[PDB]
Design a protein around this ligand. Structure first.
Ligand SMILES: Nc1nc2c(c(=O)[nH]1)N=C(CO)CN2
Ligand SMILES: Nc1nc2c(c(=O)[nH]1)N=C(CO)CN2
Ligand SMILES: Nc1nc2c(c(=O)[nH]1)N=C(CO)CN2
Ligand SMILES: Nc1nc2c(c(=O)[nH]1)N=C(CO)CN2
Ligand SMILES: Nc1nc2c(c(=O)[nH]1)N=C(CO)CN2
Ligand SMILES: Nc1nc2c(c(=O)[nH]1)N=C(CO)CN2
Ligand SMILES: Nc1nc2c(c(=O)[nH]1)N=C(CO)CN2
Ligand SMILES: Nc1nc2c(c(=O)[nH]1)N=C(CO)CN2
Lengths: 120, 120, 120, 120, 120, 120, 120, 120
């Protein structure tokens, strides 16, 4: 359907399987897509018929910076969960969590996880 | 299924939910996609069989710069409506309205809404 | 479903509806995607079972630099037709022809047309 | 389904059709996507229910840097084969092998092959 | 001394030696640097002791979009003159005028002229 | 002399001369250069013969995010002061405070002020 | 002194110490700066008092694409010699010759040489 | 005062003050500039009158990848020392060592040290 995007949110977090990651921290990034009907928000100009994109950013910050998991998968799942419980008007969401500076000896732009979740 | 694109059109507008936004203004960007047959134009080299991409740009500039709305949803909706009302070869259009510098305390590249519309 | 890409070919050409464009010339860019089965070439390391990507580039250059049309729709249509006429191991092709510096008073990345063609 | 990405891995390799390439070498890039169910791991935060992204990188480094093929097609096919053969959890994978600096006289960003492999 | 920068101003103008350029127009970009003492301004937080950078932008926009010359040298010379004319607190200014899309058959980022002017 | 750089620090602040800026806030960026003798630290590998670049970051963070000024001039001047006050080993520093999204109707990359300070 | 720039000219040449490079070729880039008084050209709007930047581009294209040297140093030297031989008004020039894809096993952006030559 | 540049060399290394860094490793980038006379090499096209930039890269790889220091200062000093010890023709060199992903909780592009050395 229609979509709200938040591109390239950047947080400093302490996620990781290695304990050294858990105390040093590192950049994390998230690309958020939520699907919902925006027709009537665009015709009414009434934010209350949509989802305040600023709250969606806050929801992500809460998971990435105020929680510590081992896997980036858990970052994605928890963000997707929090979105669907709090915003009923959202039907599906696609969350991409990016680790641009992983502890991999090599040369690459980033590693990331991407999930899509909707309502049973 | 053929497409005309206008990538990363940039405008200075005064849309926004917060009154302080309506006074200062800020950057807005629009990615435009329209769908229509281009095979006939391509074989004849006759612009009458397509749509002048310069008119599509002017249509977007007038919604973004000559109007003021609370929501970016309204920018996308008005662009889509004007395109489908004005252009008779276009069966569908996707409009992405980007707010690269929204007033959200945090770190990110941009927020955006994207809609797809066709005529009933 | 296997694909060969050529990203962001750049040429200088003289296409355009305005006679002034046909005199001055300008930059043109092309994104090429051709679909074909590549497993046979992959498991045999034999180029005879694939398509030499250098020949694809030369095909695009000839249409863009050795010809002059008025519409960019005509560039794409002529590249796609020449692709399918020359290699019927290619089942499909998507041609994006980009005009990064058109004569439009405004601010934008570029305008482009994109087409997908297959044999009837 | 859900996805693990490894973006823009960079290697120096000696693949190529021309013997001159086989001893000079050049850059090669790989974009890796694998598809699997990440719901388990997201719930449990246990890496045994996912695929260690470091192992996927090492798999790609072996094919690109430790061996020499004539075609990029062969690089992608061998990465895909090695991936699907070592992980039952992965249902599909897409491998894009980029040659950024091929010996094509002209102007472009890169050439690439992209394949998608599931289980026959 | 201290400096105020305006990076990568973008305008659309009709400058050029060829009549075709004067008709079609093209992008122009300006980089502006002006030198003056900013200590007292940073000590007092009082704009009366500096130069409103927004007036410096309008000054450059007026020369590039409200005037038309044959040469980019004249754009730079007229910006520098207007600056020293209107803002006596500026000791020196460096104007860089960029023509990114000139009618030159070839491949390049841009051509530019850069001048430095001072109070006699 | 030898230099320590911090490139492109990004903060969210509420500086600006318009009260609407003090309410909404906007991105702020800082480029930091300090000059000092680094030979000893180089030969000894001892941080105590240098300056912790993390302390320099935190020093810049307070000025930008924990205070509100009308002029970016004040930001730059207060960072340079705190550096020279607290790090006797530093003989000179250059502070570039960047405003990427100012409320200027137009198109540009950023505005910035840059200063250089040493001890009298 | 006043400056004319040509940024990031891109050519395809066959320069190289290794004979394999002379057969395959590769990308070459050039950044050009020339110094001369531009203020009479800026005041009269007459190109007779400046240097046609399109002539400068062709001069570099001639050295990079119409000849084959072993070293990038010879490319830089011959460009500079040709500029100072033809344009008496040019008192100094800086030539940067860039090999972005040298046959060096490793990871990097480019290697380059840069010379400055001035008039007797 | 001619120059050889090597831009944006990328290595994976284990330098750092914190033991956690010595275990995980991270990216390190180096910008090298060496100053010498290139006229003789440019006139003769004879590599023996310059310095093979391939050796300079290897010299830099040695220090970043085959060694571990606490400070990036020590990386820079050792690259400079080995350059001036090994190459008589080089009269001066400037080394910038970049840490793009340091363990600093914040948002920035990179930290770096830069030294210039010549023979006393
Ligand atoms: N799929 C996946 N693989 C990993 C992950 C992770 O979070 N997800 N984290 C690692 C280093 O912390 C090790 N490899
Ligand atoms: N969906 C949506 N959310 C918002 C929007 C908006 O335009 N659309 N604008 C905001 C501040 O102007 C607040 N959040
Ligand atoms: N769809 C389309 N529109 C145009 C085109 C064109 O090639 N295609 N050319 C123009 C300027 O040459 C302006 N308008
Ligand atoms: N499809 C394809 N075409 C090519 C390839 C290649 O690997 N695949 N390599 C070449 C130069 O080495 C020549 N052209
Ligand atoms: N130095 C200089 N050379 C040019 C210029 C110009 O403005 N300055 N413009 C041209 C095409 O309009 C032709 N070449
Ligand atoms: N020199 C300078 N000029 C300005 C500044 C500023 O901080 N410094 N801020 C403005 C908008 O807040 C208006 N113009
Ligand atoms: N200074 C310098 N060194 C080199 C050069 C070169 O042109 N200049 N060419 C090489 C590969 O052709 C490798 N080494
Ligand atoms: N000047 C300097 N400061 C530091 C350095 C360093 O290498 N150089 N390393 C640190 C973390 O390893 C933090 N502080």
């Amino acid at each position: 359907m229609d979509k709200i995007y938040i591109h390239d949110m950047e947080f400093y977090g302490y996620h990781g399987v290695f304990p050294e990651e858990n105390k040093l921290g590192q950049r994390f990034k998230v690309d958020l897509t939520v699907e919902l009907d925006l027709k009537r928000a665009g015709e009414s100009d009434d934010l209350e018929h949509s989802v305040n994109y600023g709250e969606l950013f806050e929801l992500c910050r809460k998971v990435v910076e105020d929680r510590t998991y081992k896997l980036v998968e858990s970052i994605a799942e928890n963000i997707a969960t929090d979105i669907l419980k709090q915003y009923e008007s959202i039907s599906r969401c696609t969350i991409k969590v990016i680790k641009p500076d992983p502890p991999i000896p090599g040369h690459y732009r980033a590693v990331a996880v991407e999930i899509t979740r909707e309502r049973p």
